[PDB]
Amino acid sequence: MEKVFYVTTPIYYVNAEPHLGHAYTTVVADFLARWHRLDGYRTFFLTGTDEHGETVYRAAQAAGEDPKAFVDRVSGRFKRAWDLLGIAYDDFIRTTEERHKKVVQLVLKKVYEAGDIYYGEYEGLYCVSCERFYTEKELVEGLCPIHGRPVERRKEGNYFFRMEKYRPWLQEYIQENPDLIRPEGYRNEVLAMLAEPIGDLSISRPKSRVPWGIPLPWDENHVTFVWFDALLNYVSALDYPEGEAYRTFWPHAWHLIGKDILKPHAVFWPTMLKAAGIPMYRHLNVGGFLLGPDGRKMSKTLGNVVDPFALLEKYGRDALRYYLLREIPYGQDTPVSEEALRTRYEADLADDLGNLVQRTRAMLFRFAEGRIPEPVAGEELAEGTGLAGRLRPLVRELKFHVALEEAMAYVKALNRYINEKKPWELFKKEPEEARAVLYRVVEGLRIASILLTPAMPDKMAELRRALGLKEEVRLEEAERWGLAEPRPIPEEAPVLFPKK
Ligand SMILES: [Zn+2]
């Protein structure tokens, strides 16, 4: 009955410009992690950067920097992005780390000793300028997507992993574990993939061609395929196989990814785990695309790119986090825009929540001597204590938008209760009843603020302070009525959600 939660995000190309996609996935993982910690779970939230491969290496060379020095520097870009977005991760794994190198080599050794490795010839269309192979689909009308020049058929010796050997097992595993891959649409997509041969996987290239990475333990002349290397970050960060973190968190592994890297996580990864004798992960949670304002995929080409940091700068971290979690159903392609963020901010935060907090403080000073009144039963508002129980399953099923919707609906109810009861009228002849109404709203806000904490950590803590409530909270405190203590509220408090 030990409550454990482990969530990972994809480790991103280290020199990549952090974008809305990176931001969304990480914000969702952060909500999940924060929510479980709030609910008393022993939690581990992993993030990181993929720092190997020839692309990274050539980027460093082009930048005129030593490769290790290059990645040491550029990796800070993602760390900066997570700080800006208020991501409370437990570890930021960089694939250049020694512990990662050792795990990748140990796992390769295991797969090798399992007899799943063989040396073979890789043949296909090649670009001698990129120094890499390209499928006909990756080409831009038969031309290298990078140099815009024709490609040529070349061959190369690589070591291969007998991935096909595990297809029957994987197919059956997914069939017998309906909730492994969510949402369901992606599961079907993967099943379609596994209906046909998946073949063997090239897990290395000559160092002569790819000189930046982890060497194969049986052949130092070859470097491990970037995907094999990168995928293992999920267990190397737990210090597999002796780390207690591995024993603790791997049994509950949740992987969050965008649909663009589905095959590697739903096909490659599972077969690698099985071959290495490592248990399967618990859930693969697949997100959709965050489309541009015009409903089309984002691209400089189209001019519909929405910059997350531009949004964060203008409306604030919590407003952005809230918007993404409230308006983007995890798993389905959804268009985003500054206009939608602004409307959501003005309606839900500035109006519904912020102004209620403002008016409540005003009425407390006016009718309650600037203090929270003596606790009274919740009456119609007491049902707010049941929201946590209703939200737990929604969160676990990736329905963050529904969860936030329910929490905010309660916030709306608190507003109507105020307008309905009118404490300013009750005070004329029955001040005790007026104060009782004010207590109910304050206690209701306390509860609502806890439910919203995983989405807006700093703002909910600020809201709590504005009402003189206990700042640090636990989800269980949202399930009992009457915890707000009759104490004075701060003489002054900045505007929680200022107009933009
Ligand atoms: Zn090329």
Q: Using CA atoms, how far apart are residues 423 and 425, in angstroms rounded to an integer?
A: 5
Residues facing residue 488 across a β-bridge: 371
Q: Let me know if 22 is a catalytic residue.
A: yes
What count of other Cβ atoms lies within 10 Å of the Cβ of residue 472?
Answer: 8
247: helix, coil or strand? helix
111: helix, coil or strand? helix
Q: Let me know if 283 is a catalytic residue.
A: no
User: 36, 52, 100, 144: which is the annotated catalytic residue?
Assistant: 144
User: 36, 52, 100, 127: which is the annotated catalytic residue?
Assistant: 127
What secondary structure, in 3-state letters, does 174-201 show? HHCCCCCEECHHHHHHHHHHHCCCCCCE
Q: Let me know if 314 is a catalytic residue.
A: no
380: helix, coil or strand? helix
Torsion of CA 325, 330, 333, 337, to 10 degrees: 0
Q: Let me know if 147 is a catalytic residue.
A: yes
**How far does the centroid of ligand 1 lie from the alpha carbon of residue 145, in Å?**
7
**How far does the centroid of ligand 1 lie from the alpha carbon of residue 131, in Å?**
7
- All residues at 6 or more sequence positions from 303 whose CB lies less than 8 Å from its CB, including other chains: none
Q: Using CA atoms, how far apart are residues 69 and 15, in angstroms rounded to an integer?
A: 12
**If you ran DSSP here, which 8-state letter would residue 150 be given?**
B
**How far does the centroid of ligand 1 lie from the alpha carbon of residue 31, in Å?**
40
User: 22, 101, 222, 421: which is the annotated catalytic residue?
Assistant: 22
Q: How far is CA 81 from CA 23, 313, 317, 396, 479, in A?
A: 8, 12, 11, 26, 34
Edge to edge, what strands does the sheet with 117-127 contain?
132-133, 117-127, 152-161, 201-202
User: 3, 147, 155, 422: which is the annotated catalytic residue?
Assistant: 147
Q: Using CA atoms, how far apart are residues 308 and 287, in angstroms rounded to an integer?
A: 17
Q: Let me know if 130 is a catalytic residue.
A: yes
Q: How far is CA 243 from CA 103, 217, 240, 263, in A?
A: 11, 21, 6, 28
Q: Decide the pairing of beta strands 219-224 and 204-206.
A: antiparallel
Q: Decide the pairing of beta strands 215-216 and 219-224.
A: antiparallel
What count of other Cβ atoms lies within 10 Å of the Cβ of residue 269?
Answer: 22
Amino acid residing at 30: D
User: 79, 102, 110, 130: which is the annotated catalytic residue?
Assistant: 130
Q: Let me know if 19 is a catalytic residue.
A: yes
- Sorted by where each starts, the structural domains of the chain and their CATH numbers stand as 1-115+227-336 (3.40.50.620), 116-226 (2.170.220.10), 337-500 (1.10.730.10)
Q: Is the peptide bond before 183 cis (omega within 30 degrees of 0)?
A: yes
- Measured in whole angstroms, the distance separating CA 458 from the mean position of its chain's CA atoms is 18
Torsion of CA 92, 274, 29, 414, to 10 degrees: -150
What secondary structure, in 3-state letters, does 324-347 show? HHHHCCCCCCEECCHHHHHHHHHH
Cβ-count burial of 300 within 10 angstroms (0-12 exposed, 13-18 middle, 19+ buried)? exposed
90 within 8 A of 46, measured Cβ to Cβ: yes
User: 3, 68, 155, 297: which is the annotated catalytic residue?
Assistant: 297
- b/e string for 75-112 if b means 16 or more Cβ within 10 A? beebbebbebbbbebbebbbbbeeebbebbbebbebbb
Q: Which residues sit in the known binding site? A: 127, 130, 144, 147, 300
**How far does the centroid of ligand 1 lie from the alpha carbon of residue 136, in Å?**
13
**Which regions of 225-288 does DSSP assign to beta strands (E)?**
253-258, 283-287
What count of other Cβ atoms lies within 10 Å of the Cβ of residue 430?
Answer: 12
Q: Which residues sit in the known binding site for ATP? A: 300
Q: Using CA atoms, how far apart are residues 46 and 42, in angstroms rounded to an integer?
A: 14
**How far does the centroid of ligand 1 lie from the alpha carbon of residue 147, in Å?**
5
**How far does the centroid of ligand 1 lie from the alpha carbon of residue 144, in Å?**
5
